[PDB]
Ligand binder design. Structure first.
Ligand SMILES: Nc1ncnc2c1ncn2[C@@H]1O[C@H](COP(=O)(O)OP(=O)(O)O)[C@@H](O)[C@H]1O
Ligand SMILES: [Mg+2]
Ligand SMILES: [Mg+2]
Lengths: 1058, 317
C-alpha cells in the first residue's frame, strides 16, 4: 500500500505538469510544490519555488520568499527592513521570530518575545508560546519555559513534549514518561491530518521521533547509574553516522544538555562546531567554541589565546581563518605551535604518553594548516618555498603516517620544481645557468619523489593522483642518478597493485630514449607480468605489433619474459587479437577505401607517387597468400584482375607512359563496381568464412577483453559466437559477441579505423570522476555517476568497445516516435531550407530568425512524450526522469571540463531501463570542436530543447542546476587529481596527434589546452580576471548552452532543435 | 527602372532583386541574384546602379541599362558583407563585414582590392557615413561603436550599455543626432558637436529609448530629422519624435491571435523624401508602404517567393 500511494501522485504530477505546459498558473504552481513534496523530491520542488519567484513576486514580501527558500539568515535582515520601514504588523513579527528559532537565536528570540508582549491577537498569543519555550530552553531560564509551556495546549505534539523536558529538569520521571507517549500519538495522528501535504515536517517528524527516543535515554540517565558509556557511545556513533543539518542537531544536543554539559562532552560539541563551520554557520560555531573555552569571544583581541584545551583552540583558530580574521588567524598559529612543542618537550614526564602522541598529532595537523595558510597569504616564491617545506616536513615528523601530510610535502616539493622550471622558461624568453638549475631541481625533485611514494602507500585503493605524479617526475627527469635511486627504492617498497591504474601510461613510454628511465619501466612491467598477467597481455600485444621499431622490440622482450611463467596466455592472446584485426577490415573493404583514395590522388591531383603508396600495401598485403575462406573466395573473383592491374602499373613505373597506366585503371574500376554492389549485402559475417581460428576457440585462459581485475574471479573467453552482425555505416563496425566462462554473454563493437586510445584515457578520467562522486556525501546521496564502458585498443586502426545493454541513440528513439506519429524525420530541417535555401550563409541575425521559425513550428516534446509512453507505470516513469536529469547534468559539467565536443543525437544514448544518459564517441576533446574552421561549435555541452523538455517542468532550476553545482563543486575541490589525469594524456607522446589537427613545437599548444582546463576548474573560464564561483559559472554555462545565437550556428547534423 | 522618378528595390532569400513602381505595386523588372541572400541594398547617390551586399560579394546592377547583369562585383572578402554606404561624390563605397573589417572601395578604378581597411575585433554589423563625408561610424558585434576619421585615420571608439552587439547606427541629414540600435532592443541617441573642418565632432549621450523587447534590427532617421524609425524582430517598426523621443506611430504585422507563432520580422525601412511615408521589408515575402501619420498600409508589394530583408528607396532630382 505504501509503494501504491506514490503511484497516484506520480501519475497526477504527470497531468499536473502537462497542465502547467498549457499555462503557468499560481493555482498549479501551488499544487506542484505540494505533489513534488509528498513524492519526497525536495530539490525538484525547490525548483518550482525558484520559478515561482522569477515569475510571480506575488506571494510577495521578499522576506516571505527567503523564508520559503529556507534562507533564514537572509529573511531575518529582510524582515528588519520590512519592520523598520513599516510598523508593528503582527504577521511580520511572527516571521521575524521563525527566522530566529530556525537560526538557533534563542537570545534574540526570547528578547523579541518578552519586550513585545502586548500581542492583542490571540493567535499571535498562541503561536508565540511554542517558540518562546524552546528559546527559554536554550537559554536555561526554566521559569520562563514553564510560563510559556503553561500557555502551549496539551492537545499539541509540541505542548505534550515541552512538559516531558520540564519534568526531566525537575526530576519528575513518571510525568516525563507519560508526556512522551502522549506527544507521540499527538504526532502520529498529526501525520494523518495533513496526510501528504506538509513541510519538511514529514522529515522533521524524524527529528521529533529521534529526539523523543533520545529523551527516553536522557530518562535512562537520571536514577539507576548503569549505561553512561553505552549511552554516550550510541550518542556519539549515531552522530558521525547521522547527517542532519545544523538546526536539528542544536535541539538534539539540547536534549543531551539536560545531562552532559559541554565540558564533559567536549568531542561531541567540537564535531558539531566542526559541522557548523563546514555548512556555513560560523557565528554559531564561534559561540559553541567560546562556551567550550570558558573564555571570551576574545574581546581582548590583542591578547594570546588560552592553551588550556589544545583541541578547542585549534578549532577556534581554524574557525577564525574560515571567518574574516586570517592574518590574525595565521599569527595565532605560529605562536600556538611554539607553545605546543614546549608543553610537549617539558611537560611530558614519561608517565604521560597518550597525551604526548595526541599532542604530537594535533601539532602535525597544525603545521599542515600553517603551510597551507602561508601559501594562501603569500603564494609560491623564493621566500615561502623553504618556509612551507619547513612546515610540512615538520608535519611529516609528528604524524609519520597520515596521507595528507606526506602528500602535501610531495606536492609542495613538486611545485618547488615547477616554480623554477617555469621561472627559467621566463629567463630564456629574454652555463652557470644550468649548473645552478641542476642543483636547484635535483634538490626538490628527489624529496618530491620520496614524498609521493610514502604518500601512495598510505592511499591503497585511492592513489591515482600520486601514482601519476611519481610518473611525471620519473619520465620527465632523463635520469640523473639521485632521482633514479629514489625511484628504484619506491618501486621496491610500493605494492604492485598501484601500477595497474597506470599501465597505459607506462606502456606509452616503453620505447623511452632515456637509458635509465627505460630500464626501470621494463623491469617494473615484467614484475607486473609475474603477478597480474592479463592486465598486461592485451596492451603489450598491441605494442608488440608496432611500426615504430623500438616499441614493438621492447614490447616483445617483456612478452618473452612472460612466456617463462604464462606462455599459452601470451599465445592465446597473441592469436585472438591477430584474428580480430583480420575480421575488423576484410580484404575487399581495404580495397574499397583504397580504390577511392587512389582515384582522388590520380584523377583529381595528378599524384601517382602517392597513389602507388596507397595501392602497394594492398598488393603486398595479399602477396602473403589467402589464410581464410573469405580471403580466398575474394582471391578468385577479384585477385587475378588486381594481380595484372599491378602488372600494367609496373609497366608504367619503368616505361613512364600513360596508356600503360590507363589499362590498370580500367581493371581497377571494374573490381570497384563489383565490391560496391556486394557491400550493402555485408550485413553479417560467419566466423567459419572470415576467421576459422576464432570459431576454433574453446575454453581459453584469456580473460574476456577488459573484464580482468584482482578481487574478482577471472572470466575467460569460453567460446566466440559464430556470427557477427555488420552494423551498416561508413566504417561497418562489427557486433562481435563472446561467451563467458561464467556463462554470461559479452557483446562488443569491433571498430576498424578509429584510434581507440583517446577513448581509453577518457574512460580512465571518468573512472576517477566516478570515485570522486562516490566520496562526496551529497553526490553519493543522489547516486551521481557516469555510465562508462570497456575500451580495449587492438591497434592504431582498430579496437573493441563494450556494448552497453538496453540502449538506443537519442536519434533512434526520435526516428521511431516520429515515424509512429507520422512526422517527417527531418522536418525542422526541411522547414529551414524552405524558408532560407542558403541558410548556412546567412548573418547571425538572419540565422536566428530561421532557427526560431523552425522551433515554433515543430513539437518540442517528442523525447519527453515517448519516454511517457515507454513507461510501464508512473513511479518508474518518474524515477527514470530523476535518473535522466541527473546523469545528464553530470556529463554536462564533466564534458565541459574535458572540452567534449561533437554531442549530436547519435553520440549520446539513453538507458531504457534506468533512464540514465550515456556518452559515446570521444573524438573531439578539449576546445578542438570549437576551434575548428568549418562550422565551429559555440555550445559547451548539448542542452538541446527536447532534452530540457524531458526533465521536470521548472527543469533547469530544479534537479539539473542543483546537480550541476554539486558535480562542479566536487571537481573544483579535487582539481589536482583531475589535472593529473588530463595532463597525463595531453603531454603523452603518442596522443598529441589530435591537436596538430588545428591545421585541418606542440609543447606550446599542449600548455594552453591544460591552462584552459585549469581556468575551468578555478572559475577563470570566462572573464580573465574575475574568479567566478560555482553557481555563477554554471549559470553562465547553461546560458551559453541555451543561447539561440549559439545553437543556430551548429552544424545541421547536430540537430540543434532536438 | 532608374529612369522612373521613384526607385524601390526589394531583395531576400529568393535569389532576385525586384524593382517596384511606388504608386501602384506593379513590379517593373527583376534581376537574378544567385548563390546568396541579400544583406543590404543601397542605390548610389548618382542614381546610376544599385549595390547588393551579399555573402562574400557585393554585386551591383544598373538602374540605367534597364536590363543586363552585375556591372561590378567585388570578391575575395570572406564571410558576409553586411552594410553598404556611399559617398555623395561618386567614387567611394564603404562596407562592414563579418570579417571584422570596414573597407573603402574605389568605384572609379579596377582591382577587387579596396583602397583602405579598418580592422576591428568582432564582426561589423553596420557602417554609416557622417553627412560631412569625413567620418565613418562603425558598429560591431561586441557593442563598440567606432568613429573612424577618413582623414586623420585616427580611430575613436565608444561603447554604450554594450556587452551587447549594436545592430545598426544612423545619423540624420542635419548631423544633429546619432542613433545606435542593439540586440537587447535599445536605441541610443547622441547629440552631435559639429567640429567639421579641423574636426572635433564629439558625442553627448542624450537618451536611451527602450524601443523593443526583442532584437532591434535597424534604425533610421527621416530626411526631416523630425522622426526616428526602429525596425525589429517583434514584427514592428516604431516611429519616434525627435523633439519628444516619444512613440508617434507603430507599424506591425502581429498576426491577430496569440497562437500564430508570428510569420515575419521587420527587417528594413526607408522614409520618402518628404518624410511623409515609410517603406517596410518583412520576412513574410512582402515589402509594404505605410502612411507615417495614420499608420495605414497604403500599399503592399507582393512578388517575392521567399523572405525579404532588403530595401532601397530613392527620391532625387
Ligand atoms: N558503447 C556502445 N554501446 C552501444 N552502441 C554503440 C556503442 N558504441 C557505438 N555504438 C553504435 O555504433 C554506432 C556508431 O558508433 P560511434 O561510436 O558513434 O562512431 P562514429 O561516430 O565513428 O560513427 C552508434 O550509432 C551506436 O548504435
Ligand atoms: Mg557517432
Ligand atoms: Mg566520432
Amino acid at each position: 500500500e505504501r509503494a501504491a500511494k506514490c503511484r497516484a501522485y506520480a501519475k497526477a504530477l504527470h497531468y499536473k505538469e502537462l497542465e502547467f505546459q498549457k499555462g503557468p498558473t499560481p493555482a498549479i504552481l501551488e499544487s506542484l510544490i505540494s505533489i513534488n513534496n509528498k513524492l519526497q523530491q525536495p530539490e525538484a520542488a525547490a525548483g518550482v519555488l525558484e520559478y515561482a519567484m522569477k515569475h510571480f513576486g506575488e506571494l510577495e514580501i521578499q522576506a516571505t520568499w527567503y523564508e520559503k527558500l529556507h534562507e533564514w539568515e537572509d529573511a531575518l535582515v529582510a524582515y528588519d527592513k520590512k519592520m523598520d520601514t513599516n510598523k508593528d504588523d503582527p504577521e511580520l513579527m511572527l516571521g521575524r521570530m521563525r527566522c530566529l528559532e530556525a537560526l538557533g537565536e534563542w537570545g534574540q528570540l526570547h528578547q523579541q518575545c518578552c519586550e513585545k508582549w502586548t500581542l492583542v491577537n490571540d493567535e499571535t498569543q498562541a503561536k508565540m508560546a511554542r517558540m518562546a519555550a524552546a528559546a527559554a530552553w536554550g537559554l536555561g531560564q526554566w521559569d520562563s519555559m514553564e510560563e510559556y509551556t503553561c500557555m502551549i495546549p496539551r492537545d499539541t505534539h509540541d505542548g505534550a513534549f515541552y512538559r516531558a523536558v520540564l519534568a526531566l529538569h525537575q526530576d519528575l520521571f513518571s510525568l516525563a514518561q507519560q508526556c512522551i507517549d502522549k506527544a507521540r500519538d499527538l504526532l502520529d495522528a498529526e501525520l494523518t491530518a495533513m496526510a501528504g501535504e506538509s513541510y519538511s515536517r514529514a522529515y522533521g517528524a524524524m527529528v521529533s521521533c529521534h529526539m523523543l527516543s533520545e529523551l527516553e535515554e536522557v530518562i535512562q540517565y537520571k536514577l539507576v547509574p548503569e549505561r553512561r558509556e553505552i549511552i554516550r557511545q550510541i550518542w556519539w556513533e549515531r552522530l558521525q553516522g547521522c547527517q542532519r543539518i545544523v538546526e536539528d542537531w542544536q535541539k538534539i544536543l539540547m536534549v543531551r544538555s539536560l545531562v552532559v554539559s559541554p565540558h564533559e562532552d567536549m568531542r561531541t560539541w567540537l564535531k558539531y562546531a566542526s559541522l557548523c563551520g563546514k555548512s556555513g554557520r560560523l557565528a554559531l560555531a564561534h559561540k559553541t567554541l567560546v562556551l567550550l573555552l570558558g573564555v571570551d569571544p576574545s574581546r581582548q583581541l590583542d591578547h594570546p589565546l588560552p592553551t588550556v584545551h589544545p583541541q578547542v583552540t585549534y578549532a577556534y583558530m581554524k574557525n577564525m581563518w574560515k571567518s574574516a580574521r586570517k592574518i590574525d588567524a595565521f599569527q595565532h598559529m605560529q605562536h600556538f605551535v611554539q607553545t605546543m612543542q614546549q608543553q610537549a618537550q617539558h611537560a611530558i614526564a614519561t608517565e604521560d604518553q597518550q597525551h604526548k602522541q595526541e599532542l604530537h598529532k594535533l601539532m602535525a595537523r597544525c603545521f599542515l594548516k600553517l603551510g597551507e595558510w602561508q601559501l594562501n597569504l603569500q603564494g609560491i616564491n623564493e621566500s615561502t618555498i623553504p618556509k612551507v617545506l619547513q612546515y610540512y616536513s615538520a608535519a611529516t615528523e609528528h604524524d609519520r603516517s597520515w596521507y595528507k601530510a606526506w602528500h602535501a610535502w610531495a606536492v609542495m616539493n613538486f611545485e618547488a620544481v615547477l616554480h623554477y622550471k617555469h621561472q627559467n622558461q621566463a629567463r630564456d624568453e629574454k652555463k652557470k645557468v644550468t649548473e645552478d638549475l641542476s642543483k636547484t631541481l635535483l634538490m626538490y625533485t628527489v624529496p618530491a619523489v620520496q614524498g609521493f611514494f610514502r604518500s601512495i602507500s598510505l592511499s591503497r585503493g585511492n592513489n591515482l593522483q600520486d601514482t601519476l605524479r611519481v610518473l611525471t617526475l620519473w619520465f620527465d627527469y632523463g635520469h640523473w642518478p639521485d632521482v633514479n635511486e629514489a625511484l628504484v627504492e619506491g618501486v621496491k617498497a610500493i605494492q604492485i597493485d598501484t601500477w595497474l591504474q597506470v599501465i597505459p601510461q607506462l606502456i606509452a613510454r616503453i620505447d623511452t630514449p632515456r637509458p635509465l628511465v627505460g630500464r626501470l619501466i621494463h623491469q617494473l612491467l615484467t614484475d607486473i607480468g609475474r603477478y597480474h598477467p592479463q592486465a598486461l597481455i592485451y596492451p603489450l600485444t598491441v605494442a608488440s605489433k608496432s611500426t615504430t621499431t623500438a616499441r614493438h622490440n621492447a614490447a616483445n622482450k617483456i612478452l618473452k619474459n612472460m612466456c617463462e611463467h604464462s606462455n599459452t596466455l601470451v599465445q592465446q592472446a597473441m592469436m585472438v587479437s591477430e584474428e580480430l584485426i583480420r575480421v575488423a577490415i576484410l580484404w575487399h573493404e581495404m580495397w574499397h577505401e583504397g580504390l577511392e583514395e587512389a582515384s582522388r590522388l590520380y584523377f583529381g591531383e595528378r599524384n601517382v607517387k602517392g597513389m602507388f603508396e596507397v595501392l602497394e600495401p594492398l598488393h603486398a598485403m595479399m602477396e602473403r597468400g589467402p589464410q581464410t575462406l573469405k580471403e580466398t573466395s575474394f582471391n578468385q573473383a577479384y585477385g587475378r584482375d588486381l594481380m595484372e592491374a599491378q602488372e600494367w602499373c609496373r609497366k608504367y613505373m619503368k616505361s613512364g607512359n600513360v596508356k600503360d597506366l590507363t589499362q590498370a585503371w580500367d581493371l581497377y574500376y571494374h573490381v570497384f563496381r563489383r565490391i560496391s554492389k556486394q557491400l550493402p549485402q555485408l550485413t553479417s559475417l560467419e566466423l567459419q568464412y572470415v576467421s576459422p581460428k576464432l570459431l576454433m576457440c574453446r575454453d581459453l585462459e584469456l580473460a574476456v577483453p577488459g573484464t580482468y581485475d584482482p578481487n574478482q574471479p577471472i572470466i575467460r573467453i569460453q567460446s566466440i559466437a559464430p556470427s557477427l552482425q555488420v552494423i551498416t555505416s561508413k566504417q561497418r563496425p562489427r557486433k562481435l559477441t563472446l561467451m563467458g566462462s561464467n556463462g554470461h554473454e559479452f557483446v562488443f563493437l569491433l571498430k576498424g579505423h578509429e584510434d581507440l586510445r583517446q577513448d581509453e584515457r577518457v574512460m580512465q578520467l571518468f573512472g576517477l570522476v566516478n570515485t570522486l562522486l562516490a566520496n562526496d556525501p551529497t553526490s553519493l546521496r543522489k547516486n551521481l555517476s557516469i555510465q562508462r564502458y570497456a575500451v580495449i585498443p587492438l591497434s592504431t586502426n582498430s579496437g573493441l568497445i563494450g556494448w552497453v545493454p538496453h540502449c538506443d541513440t537519442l536519434h533512434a528513439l526520435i526516428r521511431d516516435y516520429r515515424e509512429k506519429k507520422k512526422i517527417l524525420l527531418n522536418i525542422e530541417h526541411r522547414i529551414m531550407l524552405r524558408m532560407a535555401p542558403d541558410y548556412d550563409h546567412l548573418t547571425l541575425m538572419q540565422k536566428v530568425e530561421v532557427f526560431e521559425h523552425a522551433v515554433n513550428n515543430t513539437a518540442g516534446d517528442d523525447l519527453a512524450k515517448l519516454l511517457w509512453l515507454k513507461s510501464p507505470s508512473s513511479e518508474v516513469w518518474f524515477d527514470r526522469r530523476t535518473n535522466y536529469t541527473r546523469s545528464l547534468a553530470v556529463m554536462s559539467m564533466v564534458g565541459y571540463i574535458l572540452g567534449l565536443g561533437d554531442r549530436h543525437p547519435s553520440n549520446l544514448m539513453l538507458d531504457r531501463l534506468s533512464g540514465k544518459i550515456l556518452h559515446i564517441d570521444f573524438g573531439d576533446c578539449f576546445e578542438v570542436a570549437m576551434t575548428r574552421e568549418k562550422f565551429p561549435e559555440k555550445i559547451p555541452f548539448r542542452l538541446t530543447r527536447m532534452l530540457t523538455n524531458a526533465m521536470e517542468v521548472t527543469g533547469l532550476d530544479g534537479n539539473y542546476r542543483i546537480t550541476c553545482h554539486t558535480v562542479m563543486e566536487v571537481l573544483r575541490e579535487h582539481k589536482d587529481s583531475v589535472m593529473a589525469v588530463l595532463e597525463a594524456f595531453v603531454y603523452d607522446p603518442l596522443l598529441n596527434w589530435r591537436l596538430m589537427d588545428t591545421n585541418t613545437a606542440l609543447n606550446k599548444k599542449a600548455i594552453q589546452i591544460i591552462n584552459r582546463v585549469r581556468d575551468k576548474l578555478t572559475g577563470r573560464d570566462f572573464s580573465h580576471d574575475d574568479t567566478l564561483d560555482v553557481p555563477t559559472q554554471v549559470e553562465l554555462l547553461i546560458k551559453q548552452a541555451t543561447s539561440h545565437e549559439n545553437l543556430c550556428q551548429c552544424y545541421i547534423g547536430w540537430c540543434p532543435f532536438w | 527602372v532608374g529612369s522612373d522618378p521613384v526607385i524601390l528595390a526589394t531583395a531576400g532569400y529568393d535569389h532576385t532583386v525586384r524593382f517596384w513602381q511606388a504608386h501602384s505595386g506593379i513590379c517593373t523588372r527583376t534581376v537574378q541574384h544567385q548563390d546568396s541572400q541579400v544583406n543590404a541594398l543601397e542605390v548610389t547617390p548618382d542614381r546610376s546602379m544599385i549595390a547588393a551586399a551579399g555573402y562574400q560579394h557585393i554585386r551591383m546592377y544598373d538602374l540605367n541599362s534597364n536590363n543586363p547583369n552585375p556591372i561590378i562585383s567585388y570578391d575575395g572578402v570572406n564571410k558576409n558583407i553586411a552594410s553598404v554606404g556611399f559617398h555623395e561624390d561618386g567614387r567611394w563605397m564603404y562596407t562592414g563585414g563579418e570579417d571584422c573589417t570596414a573597407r573603402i572601395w574605389d568605384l572609379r578604378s579596377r582591382n577587387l582590392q579596396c583602397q583602405r581597411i579598418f580592422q576591428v575585433n568582432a564582426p561589423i554589423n553596420c557602417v554609416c557615413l557622417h553627412p560631412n563625408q569625413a567620418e565613418l561610424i562603425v558598429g560591431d558585434q561586441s557593442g563598440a561603436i567606432h568613429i573612424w576619421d577618413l582623414k586623420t585615420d585616427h580611430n575613436e571608439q565608444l561603447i554604450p550599455e554594450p556587452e551587447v552587439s549594436i545592430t545598426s547606427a544612423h545619423i540624420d541629414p542635419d548631423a544633429s543626432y546619432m542613433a545606435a540600435v542593439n540586440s537587447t532592443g535599445n536605441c541610443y541617441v547622441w547629440n552631435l558637436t559639429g567640429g567639421i573642418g579641423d574636426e572635433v565632432t564629439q558625442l553627448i549621450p542624450k537618451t536611451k529609448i527602450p524601443a523593443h523587447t526583442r532584437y532591434a534590427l535597424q534604425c533610421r532617421f527621416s530626411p526631416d530629422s523630425t522622426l526616428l524609425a526602429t525596425c525589429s524582430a517583434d514584427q514592428t517598426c516604431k516611429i519616434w519624435r525627435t523633439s519628444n523621443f516619444s512613440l508617434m506611430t507603430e507599424l506591425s504585422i502581429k498576426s491577430g491571435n496569440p497562437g500564430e507563432s508570428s510569420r515575419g520580422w521587420m527587417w528594413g525601412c526607408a522614409f520618402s523624401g518628404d518624410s511623409q511615408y515609410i517603406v517596410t521589408a518583412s520576412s513574410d515575402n512582402l515589402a509594404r508602404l505605410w502612411c507615417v501619420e495614420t499608420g495605414e498600409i497604403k500599399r503592399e508589394y507582393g512578388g517575392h517567393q521567399k523572405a525579404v530583408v532588403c530595401l532601397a528607396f530613392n527620391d532625387s532630382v
